[PDB]
């Protein structure tokens, strides 16, 4: 007697096919990442520029309360939080807000550099500040910006600065708007009053915008902020005649590639990752997570999923071949060296000897599949989350509905690929099983009997040496023409 | 004799799959909604806004053809028409126009609150009015407004503000006036050097009114340029002007729980309901694409350019991979009414139609889970599609485009073949049940037996209506009948 | 004795699947296209607009160095050097310079009319030139355009229009010249406080000279900052100025079916034809998928991040999911070639490879519906890819590249998968025509036969090369063989 089985353990792995649900399988492999390691980390060797609770133009500008602050040279993105409390310390706005941020989300080196020292305004004031800008408890002001009235008289202020620092470099200037016209000349003299900024590609004109506002920060003043970027070897020319925010300094940039501005609390901790999101790192070889939408690095597909579990191994039992669940009614608890096998009744023993031959070719399909759905997956490196004013509202709806379009997709094709792969892989387990059925029944023939649970009844003494023929699939039939039927 | 078979009917539905084109099948399950209700709905519970044939602008700026528009207030997304009549009957511009739009589309609550009453410019002329913007048949202009003109041979500094006391944000819009020459200019408003003043906390703008020759629309040289702010709780907004200033008399509460889409179409209202709204009509189904039209509102199946997505669910129609439909059983049994696989028997007593329930519901099963797959694992959160764009972002309304093109390439391709793919699998499953259900006979039997030829057994013994039913039921002894007339 | 066999040969072509790699397949599709025929060529009947190396800016304002440019008609895309020598000669910008640019990027339909001739300025300076625009080697201008300044110490109100009676919507582009300071204002213009006022039926606006020092460029200190309208029919246009204008000449009737693309690229029109243009070439494909180059033009296959796709159309090569194919019948037949299985007979006269040609042509057709079913459902519209934008929207670019790439990474991992897939089911098909072969023999034998093992039956009784024919062709008597050597 040699019967044919298939291994069976004591697994609680449910997966699901497209044909079935909750169906308990032997080994299982999640393809699913959802794992984080809590901390904010190094992208690839090189740290992120931590904002604290500044915003950029907050730092950039020079707010007092962004003293403190730390600025690495490289960074390969930006942290912020949500909503910053140090901005625009003095009321105002920024134009190309966005555009500004997003250029300085990712840097080869940036380095800080004085271009217009204040103590060449020989002619104007150079030490108007505001209680909006306090520091316990003066007027002060923007540590990187400067002009008013020297007496009575506002003279026009031009200045120049030639960009020998052999980068790229950015420049911020500002116009102030005053709340009325007295103001305006208590301030300034003159009043039509203009600010021209000009480069090579630059040519802006500016006037003030005066209306009566509400206090913002004690203040109904107004400051609108501008950059540009002055190539290497150009000029760009200040001229005034009142209402100038002038730098003092200018940035030196380089850019190889871009990322993005994530927003978090969290702080750098000093680990390393190919990939950051606002909860942790993630480091894992699937093609799929659900940890959170707004990635920063090379990441796995984002889903909507919460289970993507491929079946690697058979049914477990205590389908389209009719072998496993079957015509082979149970699995073995005992053979535990492979997944199809064999068990002997012999006068010698009995008798649970496990396919090598077969189990392998499975290990190794079920490998290849396992690699295929992973190794498949394409993952270049993107920033996802973006920043639109108020007046994007479009735009920004139109980024959403295409990130959203995405989601569905590869959730979809996830659910759906598991589903397939995994009616396919159970199968697989009973196809392989009804063969190795075949393949001793069409060595014995006559010389057994067929019950019908997957046995064969010997109709001549066989030994040891005999099945551990079998098994290796070199039995004679010649050797035993008893016909004991 | 006891004999294996299949269904058969009298189906003509046809489905293709990977392998083979127009398969005549059992049952199917069209997996493609393809008609609408006709109708313009209500959508979850709430109307749109309807515009008749007022623009947003001309409805906001009370436009006097805009009268009896019918303001609700509440909505979920707004029905305009593709070129609406009555919108500036005084010719101008609205900035960031499609950004107000975008805004207005979907509303929680609005309602229209009477901030600067007219009466309160007590130094200035109100009943300022134009033939552009007439009321059968004297001069009027938009209802929301207030043209302020100088009275006498003055116009003192126009000087007003009014500070968001009402508990919601508050849309506010209000125009500067472009006159067509000096004489209008000075009839108008007396002095020469004007702007109009306008500031909030966050806004800050003085516009200064550009005289200049221009064409007549609506019989106007003149221009009015309208723009719009969202006053904040508790904050203030300043008017001044010293002419040329249109002021608001009103603003709107506004409360926004997310974003929708403006409809353009010329059906009305009609007093039914939808998760999802199309221009042709509305769409109720369970289905996980349609084909109806692209520019959809709310919770809607994926737009597939293709036209039939047919499930096989039941078998080959007889009246493949396994070898058993059309193949070594040559075909189906119209006979068999109450399964899809089952038994025919021949007996001293009768003869013979038994289905084979245990099997026949484990296909029932598989099949009703493999269309609840395909239907089920499709996401569906509510989206607006339609999209605005000015004749100056061409470049945008294409990105747009490439966009939601991409994705209709996307799912159309995967639709058209993971249907032709089930489709396969699904006969393929159904002939590995028949050949299945012929091996646990088979191997039942055994000797006791002998294969007929066509999923057919002949007994070497006798079998009478109970013998017959431990076979049906699996449990055939076959001990017993150890007679061999063989 | 009979024996069931399968095709094999001398084919080294590789396929992967689901399940093993680099396995030898006896006929082989590849289903992504890579060639091009390296010229760039003419879309669908219509020609590219080629610049040579112009900028559009610098062609549609009459650049001196765009003078033998040859001007089509028609075009369908335009060809620009990623990066022209001659634009802007003169130094300044272009309002709404891509806007523009998308909108020329395929045209009906464009002539240039000449709507304001340069000598009805009567009252203005007419030949202002610059070094900038230099002739060799005296001074000129952009040739379409005209520099009015004054005469004498004089500079009336410049003041014409321009009702379009050309039929055509037509393009119309004017400009303001930026000066260096005061004295450079006074000696071209007289006057200080100019403005430039344009005005259409919708268009409407004025422009103030911005005075200031610049870096020079093009040896020039002095900016002029373009603008451009599409002036409708029978509307008209509006110049007034008291300084600084720089006039049109001549306006541009253009008509437009759609759009299209720029192609960026050094390469020169080839005189031939495809409905896809890639910068490298044009494709002329019926496949799926290509992976030439991401920036086509024109109706084109998806392009993908992958460099084979190859679907099994043979079977295993050998010198299965049913046993068959290299496992109970272990060997394939270098023999038998008329087709993909067959039968191999032990006889006294011949022996013996008979194909089975009713099971062969249901797997050609078969295989065939599959490769057909995986490119004939991929549609494709026309579309231009690639992209203009100033170095002010990068993060609109990026929004742009975020979607290219995301359909990259959907189509690629689709399109790996789909193969692999399809290839796992390819083999287990023809695995599965194996079995079904013999097990279509054995059911028709039986006790009449010995089924020896590597897929062959072993005769009990005289089989002449007449009774094979009745296995072979599926029609063989059991009855007439009652010969029991057994």
């Known amino acids: 007697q040699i019967c044919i089985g298939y291994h069976a353990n004591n697994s609680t792995e449910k997966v699901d096919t497209i044909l079935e649900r909750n169906v308990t399988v ?180 500016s006037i003030p915008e005066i209306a009566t506002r509400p206090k913002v920060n004690g203040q109904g003043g107004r400051m609108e902020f501008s950059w540009t970027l002055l190539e290497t070897w150009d000029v760009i020319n200040f001229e005034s005649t009142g209402n100038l925010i002038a730098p003092e300094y200018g940035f030196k940039i380089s850019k190889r590639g871009s990322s993005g501005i994530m927003k978090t609390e969290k702080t750098l901790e000093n680990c390393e990752t190919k990939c950051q999101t606002p909860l942790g790192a993630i480091n894992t070889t699937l093609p799929f997570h659900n940890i959170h939408p707004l990635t920063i690095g090379e990441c796995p597909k984002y889903v909507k999923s919460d289970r993507l579990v491929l079946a690697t191994g058979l049914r477990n039992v205590p389908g389209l071949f009719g072998a496993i669940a079957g015509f082979i009614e149970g699995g073995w608890q005992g053979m535990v060296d492979g997944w199809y096998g064999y068990h002997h009744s012999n006068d010698q023993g009995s008798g649970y000897a496990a396919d090598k031959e077969s189990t392998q070719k499975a290990f190794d399909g079920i490998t290849n599949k396992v690699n295929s759905v992973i190794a498949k997956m394409n993952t270049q490196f993107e920033a996802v989350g973006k920043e639109f004013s108020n007046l994007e509202r479009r735009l920004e709806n139109l980024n959403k509905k295409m990130e959203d379009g995405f989601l569905d997709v590869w959730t979809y094709n996830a659910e759906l690929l598991v589903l397939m792969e995994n009616e396919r892989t159970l199968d697989f387990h009973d196809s392989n099983v009804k063969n190795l059925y075949d393949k001793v029944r069409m060595q014995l023939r006559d010389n057994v009997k067929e019950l019908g649970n997957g046995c064969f009844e010997f109709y001549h003494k066989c030994d040891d040496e005999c099945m551990n023929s079998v098994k290796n699939g070199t039995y004679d039939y010649p050797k035993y023409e008893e016909e004991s039927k």
Not at 53 to 81: F, H, M, Q, T
Not at 126 to 135: E, F, K
């Open 26 to 205: 032997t080994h299982a492999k999640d393809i699913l990442e959802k794992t984080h390691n809590g901390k904010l980390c190094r992208l690839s060797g090189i740290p992120p520029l931590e904002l604290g609770d500044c915003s950029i133009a907050g730092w950039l500008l020079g707010n007092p309360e962004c003293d403190r602050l730390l600025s690495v040279p490289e960074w390969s993105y930006i942290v912020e939080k949500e909503n910053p409390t140090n901005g625009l310390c003095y009321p105002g706005s920024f134009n190309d807000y966005e555009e500004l941020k997003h250029l300085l989300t990712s840097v080869t080196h940036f380095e800080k550099i004085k271009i217009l020292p204040r103590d060449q305004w020989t002619q104007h004031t150079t030490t108007g500040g505001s209680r909006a800008c306090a520091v316990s408890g003066n007027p002060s002001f923007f540590r990187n910006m400067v002009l008013t009235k020297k007496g009575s008289n506002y003279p026009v202020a031009k200045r120049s600065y030639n960009n020998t620092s052999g980068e790229q470099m950015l420049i911020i200037w500002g116009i102030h708007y005053p709340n009325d016209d007295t103001e305006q000349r208590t301030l300034y003299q003159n009043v039509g009053t203009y600010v021209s900024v000009g480069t090579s590609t630059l040519n802006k004109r």
